[PDB]
Symmetry: D2
């Protein structure tokens, strides 16, 4: 009985409501998130693009850019990792299936696929386009059918709220769940009551994307729990703070000609070592 | 065709000492460029601890490093100096493949060191180094493998803490005589030593101004007085990014919301300007 | 610095038509170079069927191809023309990223086509080819993405098979006008048609002389009489390698030994000579 | 959840000896499966000479191999035994990461040998091996890193040509005592030797029946009589494939057409069947 990341993801859900899931930009941060107490983590598509590739979250990244990051993270962190699979990385059901089987094999616990057209955009940006309900239904069926691990999770995300309104988004969501989606990700919700309506209408775990500087208020876990939200996602929160701190170090070092004045903003060498279990490894080298 | 190595050598000519900052990923390479830096660095200790979440003990593979080189150089035009540890393999063939691959991936140069296979931070105790002759063979293999004459083969010696100053300088002399184009005397404890290395080899020397190690936090002015050609800050940004990320994780877990740390976050517009997001969205919308 | 694209263009002026053979992996690229070829090809059908064991229906990723490009060009100096299908993505950004990545991987040039998704690969006759304007957009994105000016951007279209000769020629002229540097018209069955395309666009024309298809096995002399600039043999060696490998598997399974098929095998020394084995091992012996 | 390693062990109990054929790429792995084989192999010499066009002298990296493992196992369900040379690095940490990475890539098992870093083919002269103690440490690290208990850690010894038979058997016993699950005595020259190894370690032994080497082309019956559990044909198909490819290149270059060699080619219909083409298209 080999370990199933997906099974571990489903177990975390039953032990935390809502289950907080934080984006981890790289393997180091996955370890930091685990040490902080989280029971599940996330690989943001916008993060693979903007962080790993330094590019816009506009469907430019490829499946392999993401797989590389999944392997790096799951090779060292035992937490179940939910992965952003954008639209499935291809225009046919064959692409969706390969995507699903590859991510399962890379170590992921689950993934979400959205109903946007090819060159997708952040769910919190204007002018997004979505495929037909039928089009998305086929994507979902292909994904579910491709599962090699029954516990791997196939989550459906809908970007329809801002484009077709709430009733339309709910109808799509119900059809997606009927097609096999196991959990639902209604993107960029503006009101708490909406989460409740979605939850009541599809009766499968609901995810709330609590990202900064977008269309969604910074709801607390208490508020989300009252709306029956199953999980709270913070996709790029740590990444945003990491970039500001790094930018600060770069600027000060450039203007001052030394980093002395910003040493107090740095994780210490010992802290890094403790994060990666450094001493236990070096000791083994010394014993040779 | 453009030569990153040529751009690196040109940067040395415009700035002395040339500040080179480690960039943990592509995003950070763009931030460094925007900050004014003329050259950047891909830390081996960072590929290990950041990209892999593992100790800087010769566990990473050539490909883990190649992946980060392509990601950074695909989007950032600055010449990238790359940490190639000992060449990734036990033979001269591994060293040669490492050089050719890194050149093709987009790097401007690399540094290879004289430690044994399972190397450790130059700022950690009990390191073990190979003989002067063994290192010379690694250097000769690296130099002869160059497919771009302007690519830089920098030799790093970890011998100061192991055999002493005189021995380390003797090794540096042999390394440069063998073709090493620049020298990286690791974990120097006194400012005066940099001057001695520089005088002894007559090639650009790099000072590794990393935090929490054996080397004082020398300023560019002080390094200039010691004839240092490059001042390297390998993981500085990374260390601050880690503390910031950790703080966000802790606050969110304790408070159930990130409201109280919003003021520590890079804004959406700042991120967008950093990755030229508007240039792309405009094209899509038109 | 060396430019594979420049070498490819040089080969074209020296050999006409230029024979370009598909090489399924690095080893075969070396065999092709030793056989005298001046340019080689990375077949999209071969990456799918050979490297992935999958049908040529748009399932392969850019990365799958890039891996093969690096393996081949890291060891073989011949200019490599690469099949880039439709750019590996939904937009001009994907097309641009594909061009830059392949150049960095070591390729000499690539061909991009006009199908919608993999609809043409799937033999759909209707709404399977993008509009002339959409393909022009793909071509412009690719040409503008070139980091090496000598890298080659070739346009491929099999519109003849669905829209007729006239429409195909009209698309080709628009593609070349948009910046396509060479043309790969697919599904041609008559020599005279190659001449018609050559006259219509006035840029090098590629003839796909693959086996078991609609196109006859035209000879280089015949292709020259039709003004064809290059002759492509995409999977020729691959097909022979598969039959030979299948034969070894069957005999070994039926007989319990490979004694009876030893005579069908490349010997150890022939392999060693192909990969310059001895020059390497000697260096290890004299450390 | 499926375990390739468990499948490999099962194949052994169902086929005696188990014929294991090297598959140079995913396509050939499907050909092997369609031909009736129950286990396949990823040759290190093949990854080097075929996928990279380089000598089998420790130049390939762990990732070069991992890429071929994923390509083969993503499409072919047969258990794949993988050549891991010496663990891909100078330390036990490298050996461990190699084991864990190969399991995740989809392999059923791997073999690690007792040669020095820049290793060479077991059928080449002048090989150098590490001490018995050094190999034992590589084996312990490898066994301890197993994330799937059914994944197989096979130890290979190249000591026969260097230290002789008794020394090779002594090393083999130490390797198995260290946790090696199966044994690969390389470049054996006499059938009887296999029996001596089998009697000495009592774990399944693999015979490397590669061509043009130090080992006679023993039949599966001869191998069974010597108590050999597995018969390996590492590059057999690869060798025939290269000669056939070379022929096509030469003829095409000399004749200006491939007409005269069409009969040596797998047909399009045959290729499509081998990769289940029509199975896809109608979906
Ligand atoms: Mg996303
Ligand atoms: Mg380092
Ligand atoms: Mg093709
Ligand atoms: Mg081998």
């Amino acid at each position: 009985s080999l370990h199933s990341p997906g099974k571990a993801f489903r177990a975390a859900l039953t032990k935390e409501n809502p289950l907080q899931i934080v984006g981890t930009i790289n393997a180091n941060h996955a370890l930091l998130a685990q040490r902080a107490g989280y029971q599940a983590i996330y690989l943001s598509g916008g993060g693979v693009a903007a962080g790993s590739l330094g590019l816009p979250d506009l469907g430019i990244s490829t499946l392999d850019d993401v797989l590389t990051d999944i392997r790096r993270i799951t090779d060292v962190c035992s937490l179940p990792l939910l992965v952003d699979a954008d639209i499935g990385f291809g225009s046919s059901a064959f692409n969706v299936a390969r995507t699903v089987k590859s991510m399962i094999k890379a170590g992921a616990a689950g993934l979400h696929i959205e109903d946007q057209v090819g060159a997708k955009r952040s769910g919190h940006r204007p002018n997004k386009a979505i495929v037909s309900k039928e089009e998305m239904v086929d994507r979902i069926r292909a994904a579910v059918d491709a599962k090699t691990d029954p516990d791997f999770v196939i989550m459906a995300r809908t970007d329809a709220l801002a484009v077709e309104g709430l009733d339309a988004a709910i109808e799509r969501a119900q059809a997606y769940v009927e097609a096999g989606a196991e959990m639902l990700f209604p993107e960029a919700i503006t009101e708490l009551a909406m989460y409740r309506q979605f939850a009541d209408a599809v009766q499968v775990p609901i995810l709330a994307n609590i990202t900064e500087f977008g269309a969604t208020p910074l709801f607390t876990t208490d508020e989300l729990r009252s709306a029956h939200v199953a999980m709270a996602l913070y996709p790029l929160s740590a990444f945003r703070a990491m970039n500001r701190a790094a930018e600060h170090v770069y600027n000060v070092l450039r203007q001052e000609g030394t980093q002395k004045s910003v040493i107090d903003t740095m994780q210490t060498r010992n802290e890094l070592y403790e994060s990666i279990n450094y001493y236990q490894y070096e000791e083994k080298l010394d014993n040779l």
